[PDB]
Amino acid sequence: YTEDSIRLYLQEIGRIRLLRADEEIELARQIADLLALERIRDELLEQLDRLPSDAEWAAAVDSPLDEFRRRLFRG
DNA sequence: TGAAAAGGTAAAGGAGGTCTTAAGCTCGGCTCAATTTCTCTCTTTATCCTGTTAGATGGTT
After folding, report:
1. Which of A20, A39, A63, A70 is most buried by its number of CB atoms within 10 A?
2. Which nucleotide is nearest to A20 (CA to C1')?
3. Quick check: helix, strand or coil at residue A7?
């Protein structure tokens, strides 16, 4: 039960293991997928002048709402 | 009826206000160089935004 705040942040950091290069490549692919999906949604926002619903966004990707949502989560 | 006793009138003179000029000034207008604002352009910075590919991976006092 330390009072220092920086040391607590450093401990919280140390509870996470460094990535490996293959892990970086794998995560980078999912990040790119998320970015493209976000760009599409942004297009729906311009078309709808409102936030698209997950169903409309899933419809914009021709994807089942479950599959789409899980892909979004992974990203 | 005579006689105070007050009340008038017509002057002279003064006191006071109101007019007239010779001397001088200074004051505004008029011109006319001689310039400070103003308002456009025409730039020229002042400020903000985005990106950067060797590898790096837990503090100092």
Report:
1. A63
2. B57
3. helix
